[PDB]
PDB file of C-alpha atoms in Angstrom:
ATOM      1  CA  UNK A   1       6.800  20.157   2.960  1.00 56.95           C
ATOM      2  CA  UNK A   2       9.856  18.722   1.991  1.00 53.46           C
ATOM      3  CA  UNK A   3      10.955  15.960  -0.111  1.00 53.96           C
ATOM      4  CA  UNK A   4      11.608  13.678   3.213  1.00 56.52           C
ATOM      5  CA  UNK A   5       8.165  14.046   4.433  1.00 56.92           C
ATOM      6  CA  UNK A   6       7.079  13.542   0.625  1.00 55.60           C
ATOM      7  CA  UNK A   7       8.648  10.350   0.572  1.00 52.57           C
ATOM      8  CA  UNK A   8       7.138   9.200   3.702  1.00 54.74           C
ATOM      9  CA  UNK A   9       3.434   9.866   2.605  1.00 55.31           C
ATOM     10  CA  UNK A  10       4.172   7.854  -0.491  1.00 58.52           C
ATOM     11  CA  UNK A  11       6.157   5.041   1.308  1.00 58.62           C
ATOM     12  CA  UNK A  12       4.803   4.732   4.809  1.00 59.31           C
ATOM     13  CA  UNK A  13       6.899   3.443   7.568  1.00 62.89           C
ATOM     14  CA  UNK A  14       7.397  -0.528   8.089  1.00 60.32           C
ATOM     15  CA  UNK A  15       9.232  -1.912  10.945  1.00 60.02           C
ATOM     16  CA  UNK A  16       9.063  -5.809  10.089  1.00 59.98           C
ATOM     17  CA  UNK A  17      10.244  -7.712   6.612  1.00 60.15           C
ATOM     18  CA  UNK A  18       7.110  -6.708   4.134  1.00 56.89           C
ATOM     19  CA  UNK A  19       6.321  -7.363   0.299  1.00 58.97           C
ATOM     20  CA  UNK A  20       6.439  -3.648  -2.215  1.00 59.92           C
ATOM     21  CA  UNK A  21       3.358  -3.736  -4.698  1.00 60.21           C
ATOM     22  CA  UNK A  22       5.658  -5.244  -6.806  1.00 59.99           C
ATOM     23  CA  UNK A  23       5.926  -8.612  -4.296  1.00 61.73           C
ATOM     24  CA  UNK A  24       9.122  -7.473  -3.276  1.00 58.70           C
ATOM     25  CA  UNK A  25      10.748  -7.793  -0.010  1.00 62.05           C
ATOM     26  CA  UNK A  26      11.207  -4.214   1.980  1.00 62.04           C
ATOM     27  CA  UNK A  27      11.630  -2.393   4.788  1.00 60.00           C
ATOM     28  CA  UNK A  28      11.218   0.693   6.536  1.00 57.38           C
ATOM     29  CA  UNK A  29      10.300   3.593   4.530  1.00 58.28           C
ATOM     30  CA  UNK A  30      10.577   1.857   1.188  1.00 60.67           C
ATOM     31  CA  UNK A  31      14.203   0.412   1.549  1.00 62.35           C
ATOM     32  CA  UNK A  32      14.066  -2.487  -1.179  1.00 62.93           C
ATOM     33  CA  UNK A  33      16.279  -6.299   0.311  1.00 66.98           C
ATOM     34  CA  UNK A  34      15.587  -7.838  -2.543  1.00 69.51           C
ATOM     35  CA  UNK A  35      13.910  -8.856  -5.730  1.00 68.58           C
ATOM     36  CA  UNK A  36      14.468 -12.386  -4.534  1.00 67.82           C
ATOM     37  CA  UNK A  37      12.077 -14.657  -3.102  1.00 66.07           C
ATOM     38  CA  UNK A  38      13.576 -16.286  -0.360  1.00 67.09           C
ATOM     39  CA  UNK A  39      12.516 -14.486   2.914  1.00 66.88           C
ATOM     40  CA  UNK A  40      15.685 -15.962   4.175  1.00 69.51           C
ATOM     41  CA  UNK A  41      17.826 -14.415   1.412  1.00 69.04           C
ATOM     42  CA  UNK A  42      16.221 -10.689   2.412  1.00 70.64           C
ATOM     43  CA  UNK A  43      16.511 -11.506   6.124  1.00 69.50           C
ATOM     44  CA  UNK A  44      20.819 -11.915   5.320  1.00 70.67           C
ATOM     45  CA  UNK A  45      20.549  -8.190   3.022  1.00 72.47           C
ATOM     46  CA  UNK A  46      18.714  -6.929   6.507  1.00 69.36           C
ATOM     47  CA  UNK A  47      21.403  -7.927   9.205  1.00 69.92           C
ATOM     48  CA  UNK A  48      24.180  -6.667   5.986  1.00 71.38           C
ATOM     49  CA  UNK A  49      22.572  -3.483   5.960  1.00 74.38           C
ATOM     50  CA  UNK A  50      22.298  -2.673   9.562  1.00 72.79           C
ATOM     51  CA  UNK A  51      24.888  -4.079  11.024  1.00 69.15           C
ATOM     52  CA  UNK A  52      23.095  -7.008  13.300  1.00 63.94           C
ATOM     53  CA  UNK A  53      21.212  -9.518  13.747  1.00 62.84           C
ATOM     54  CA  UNK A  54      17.822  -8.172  13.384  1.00 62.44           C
ATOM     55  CA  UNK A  55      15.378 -11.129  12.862  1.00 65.31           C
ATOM     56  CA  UNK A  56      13.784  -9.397   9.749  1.00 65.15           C
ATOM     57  CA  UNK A  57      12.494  -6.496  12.537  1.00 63.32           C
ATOM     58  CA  UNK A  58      14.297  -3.123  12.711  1.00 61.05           C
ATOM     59  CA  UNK A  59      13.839   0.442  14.881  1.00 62.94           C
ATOM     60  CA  UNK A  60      12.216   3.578  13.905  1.00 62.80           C
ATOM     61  CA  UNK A  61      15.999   4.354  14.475  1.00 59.40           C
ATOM     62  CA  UNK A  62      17.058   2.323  11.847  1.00 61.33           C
ATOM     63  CA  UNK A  63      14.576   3.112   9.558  1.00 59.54           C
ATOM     64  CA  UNK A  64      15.153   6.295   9.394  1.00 57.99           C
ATOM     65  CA  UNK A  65      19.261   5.619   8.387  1.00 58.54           C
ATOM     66  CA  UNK A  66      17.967   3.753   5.826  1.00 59.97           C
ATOM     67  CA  UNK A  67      15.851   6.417   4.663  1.00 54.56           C
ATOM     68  CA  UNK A  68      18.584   8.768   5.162  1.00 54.72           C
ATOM     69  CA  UNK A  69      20.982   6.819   3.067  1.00 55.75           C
ATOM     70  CA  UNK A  70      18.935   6.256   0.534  1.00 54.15           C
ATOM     71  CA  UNK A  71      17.543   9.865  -0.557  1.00 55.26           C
ATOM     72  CA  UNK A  72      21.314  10.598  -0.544  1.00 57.62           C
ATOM     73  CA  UNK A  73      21.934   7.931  -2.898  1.00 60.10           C
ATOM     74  CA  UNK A  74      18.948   9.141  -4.788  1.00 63.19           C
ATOM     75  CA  UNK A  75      20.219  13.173  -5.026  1.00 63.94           C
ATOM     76  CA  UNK A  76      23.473  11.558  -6.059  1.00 64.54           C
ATOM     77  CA  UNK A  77      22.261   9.322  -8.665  1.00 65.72           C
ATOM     78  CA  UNK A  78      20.417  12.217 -10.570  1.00 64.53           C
ATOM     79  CA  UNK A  79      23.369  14.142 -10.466  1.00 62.16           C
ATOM     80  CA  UNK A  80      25.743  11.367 -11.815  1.00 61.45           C
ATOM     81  CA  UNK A  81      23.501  11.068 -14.512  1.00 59.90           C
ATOM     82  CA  UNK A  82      23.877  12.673 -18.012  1.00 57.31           C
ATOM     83  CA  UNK A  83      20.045  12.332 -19.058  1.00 56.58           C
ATOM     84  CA  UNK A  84      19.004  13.339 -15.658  1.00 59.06           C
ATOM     85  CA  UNK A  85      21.119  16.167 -13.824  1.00 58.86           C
ATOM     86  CA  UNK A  86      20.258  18.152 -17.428  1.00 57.58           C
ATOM     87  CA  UNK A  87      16.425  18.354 -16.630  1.00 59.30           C
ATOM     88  CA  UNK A  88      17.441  18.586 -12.302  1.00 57.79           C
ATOM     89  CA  UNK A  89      19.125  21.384 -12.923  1.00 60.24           C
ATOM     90  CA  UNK A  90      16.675  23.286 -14.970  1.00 62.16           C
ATOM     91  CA  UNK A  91      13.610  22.689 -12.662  1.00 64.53           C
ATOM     92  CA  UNK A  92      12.440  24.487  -9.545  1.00 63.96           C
ATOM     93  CA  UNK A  93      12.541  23.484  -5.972  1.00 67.67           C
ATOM     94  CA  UNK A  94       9.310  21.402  -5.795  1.00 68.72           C
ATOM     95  CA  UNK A  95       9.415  19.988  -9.612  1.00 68.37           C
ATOM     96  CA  UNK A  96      13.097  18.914  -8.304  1.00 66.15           C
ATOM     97  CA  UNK A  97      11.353  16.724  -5.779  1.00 64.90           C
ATOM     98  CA  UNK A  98       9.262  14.956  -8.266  1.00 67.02           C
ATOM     99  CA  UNK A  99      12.260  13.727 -10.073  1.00 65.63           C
ATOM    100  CA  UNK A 100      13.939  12.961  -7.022  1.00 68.90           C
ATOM    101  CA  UNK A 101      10.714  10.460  -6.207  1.00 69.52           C
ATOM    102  CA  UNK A 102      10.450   8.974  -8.951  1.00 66.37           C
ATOM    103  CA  UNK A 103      14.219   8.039  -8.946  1.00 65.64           C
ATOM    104  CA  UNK A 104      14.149   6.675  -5.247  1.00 61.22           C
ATOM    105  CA  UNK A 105      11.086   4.683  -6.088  1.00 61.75           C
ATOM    106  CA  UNK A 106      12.234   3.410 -10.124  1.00 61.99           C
ATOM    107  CA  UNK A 107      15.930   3.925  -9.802  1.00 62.33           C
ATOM    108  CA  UNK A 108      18.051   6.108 -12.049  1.00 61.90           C
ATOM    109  CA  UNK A 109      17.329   3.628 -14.723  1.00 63.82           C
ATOM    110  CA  UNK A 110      14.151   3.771 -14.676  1.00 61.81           C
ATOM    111  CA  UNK A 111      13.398   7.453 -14.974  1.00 63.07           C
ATOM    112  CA  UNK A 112      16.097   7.940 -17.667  1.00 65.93           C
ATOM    113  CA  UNK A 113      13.944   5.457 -20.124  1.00 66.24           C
ATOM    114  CA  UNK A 114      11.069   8.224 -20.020  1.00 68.91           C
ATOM    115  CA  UNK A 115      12.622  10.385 -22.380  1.00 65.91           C
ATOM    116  CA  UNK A 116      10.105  11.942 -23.733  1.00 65.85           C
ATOM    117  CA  UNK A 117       8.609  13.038 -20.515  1.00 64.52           C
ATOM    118  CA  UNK A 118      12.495  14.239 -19.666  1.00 63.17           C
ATOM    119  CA  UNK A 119      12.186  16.467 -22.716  1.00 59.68           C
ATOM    120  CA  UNK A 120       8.848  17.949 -22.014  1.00 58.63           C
ATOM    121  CA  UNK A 121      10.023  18.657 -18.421  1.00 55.69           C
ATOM    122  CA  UNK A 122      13.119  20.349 -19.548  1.00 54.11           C
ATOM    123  CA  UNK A 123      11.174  22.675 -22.315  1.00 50.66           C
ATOM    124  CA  UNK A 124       8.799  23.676 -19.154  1.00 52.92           C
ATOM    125  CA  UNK A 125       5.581  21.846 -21.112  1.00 51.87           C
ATOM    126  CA  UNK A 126       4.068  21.038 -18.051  1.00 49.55           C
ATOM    127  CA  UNK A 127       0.488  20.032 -19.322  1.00 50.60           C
ATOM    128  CA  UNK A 128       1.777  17.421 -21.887  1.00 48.19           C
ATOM    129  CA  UNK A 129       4.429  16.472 -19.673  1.00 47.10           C
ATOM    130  CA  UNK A 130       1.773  15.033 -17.515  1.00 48.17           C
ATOM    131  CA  UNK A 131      -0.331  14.114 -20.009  1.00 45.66           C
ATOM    132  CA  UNK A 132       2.745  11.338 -21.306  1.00 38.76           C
ATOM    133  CA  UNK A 133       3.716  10.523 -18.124  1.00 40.25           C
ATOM    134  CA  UNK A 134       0.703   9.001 -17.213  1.00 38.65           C
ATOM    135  CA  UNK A 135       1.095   6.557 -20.668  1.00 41.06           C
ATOM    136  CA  UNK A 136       3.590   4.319 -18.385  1.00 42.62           C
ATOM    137  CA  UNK A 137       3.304   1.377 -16.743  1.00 42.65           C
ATOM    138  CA  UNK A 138       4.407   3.459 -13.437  1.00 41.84           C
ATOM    139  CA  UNK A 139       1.398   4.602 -13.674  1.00 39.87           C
ATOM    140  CA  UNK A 140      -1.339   2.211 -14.294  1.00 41.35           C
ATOM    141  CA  UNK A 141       0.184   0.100 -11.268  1.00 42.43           C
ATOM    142  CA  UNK A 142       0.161   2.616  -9.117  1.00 44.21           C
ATOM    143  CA  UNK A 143      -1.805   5.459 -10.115  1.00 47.97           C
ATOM    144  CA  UNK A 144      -3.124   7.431  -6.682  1.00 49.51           C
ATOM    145  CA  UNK A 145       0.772   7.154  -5.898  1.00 48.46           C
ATOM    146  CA  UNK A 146       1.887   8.279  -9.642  1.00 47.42           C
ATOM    147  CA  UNK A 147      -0.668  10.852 -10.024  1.00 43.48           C
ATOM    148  CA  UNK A 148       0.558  12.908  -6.558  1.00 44.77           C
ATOM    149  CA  UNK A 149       4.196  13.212  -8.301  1.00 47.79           C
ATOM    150  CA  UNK A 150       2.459  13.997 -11.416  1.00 47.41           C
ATOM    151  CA  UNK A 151       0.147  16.773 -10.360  1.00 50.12           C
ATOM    152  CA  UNK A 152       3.594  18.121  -8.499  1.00 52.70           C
ATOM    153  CA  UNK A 153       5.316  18.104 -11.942  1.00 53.93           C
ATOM    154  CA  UNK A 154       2.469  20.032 -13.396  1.00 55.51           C
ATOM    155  CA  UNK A 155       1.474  22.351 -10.872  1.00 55.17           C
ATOM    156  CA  UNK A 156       4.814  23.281  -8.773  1.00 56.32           C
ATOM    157  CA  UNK A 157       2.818  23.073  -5.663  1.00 52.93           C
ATOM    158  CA  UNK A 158       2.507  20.907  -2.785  1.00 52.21           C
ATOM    159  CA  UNK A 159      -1.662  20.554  -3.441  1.00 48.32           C
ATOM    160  CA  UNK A 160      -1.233  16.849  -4.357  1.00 48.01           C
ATOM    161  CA  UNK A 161       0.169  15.973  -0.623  1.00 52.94           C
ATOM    162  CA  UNK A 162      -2.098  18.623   1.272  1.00 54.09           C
ATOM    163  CA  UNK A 163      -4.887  16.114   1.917  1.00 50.66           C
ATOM    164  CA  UNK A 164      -2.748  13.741   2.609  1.00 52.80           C
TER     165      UNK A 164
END
């Protein structure tokens, strides 16, 4: 497993213009348009981001660019960041995808208000790392979702994304 197939468990793969859990307009394998709500204004960030006129419908092809593009803007992001290239760098390979999930689907932002979590994570206090976590927002709107990245950040194993 790797954080690429990860992703796509949690994501899923969309070919036409589709609403996040959020109401937001998206693509592909969780490629946010928009927060707007004009169909019409995520249809123009569409064509801008391919390159065409797509009609709000794009190619596994395309897709997969996108998906491409952004996990390298995600890697990047962490490692731009103060807060959160500090805790990257002192994790191991599969606790490193957890952060890397959480950025793609929050943005840096996001993940660099959970500070305390950060902390625990850093000092290797796995149990109460999860146990605060799980206190968010994040995670009471999309728990099954949230608690697969959390069990990863507790365990170090793949065992969350096994059944699935």
């Amino acid at each position: 497993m790797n954080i690429f197939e990860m992703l796509r468990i949690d994501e899923g793969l969309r070919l036409k213009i589709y609403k996040d859990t959020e109401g937001y307009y998206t693509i592909g394998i969780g490629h946010l348009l928009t927060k707007s709500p004009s169909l019409n204004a995520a249809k123009s960030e569409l064509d801008k981001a391919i390159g065409r006129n797509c009609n709000g419908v794009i190619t596994k092809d395309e897709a997969e660019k996108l998906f491409n593009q952004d996990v390298d803007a995600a890697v990047r992001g962490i490692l731009r960041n103060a807060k959160l290239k500090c805790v990257y760098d002192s994790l191991d390979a599969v606790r490193r995808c957890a952060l890397i999930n959480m950025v793609f689907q929050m943005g840096e932002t996001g993940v660099a208000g959970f500070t305390n979590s950060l902390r625990m994570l850093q000092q290797k206090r796995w149990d109460e790392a999860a146990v605060n976590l799980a206190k968010s927002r994040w995670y009471n709107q999309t728990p099954n979702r949230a608690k697969r990245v959390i069990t990863t950040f507790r365990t170090g194993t793949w065992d969350a994304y096994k059944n699935l």
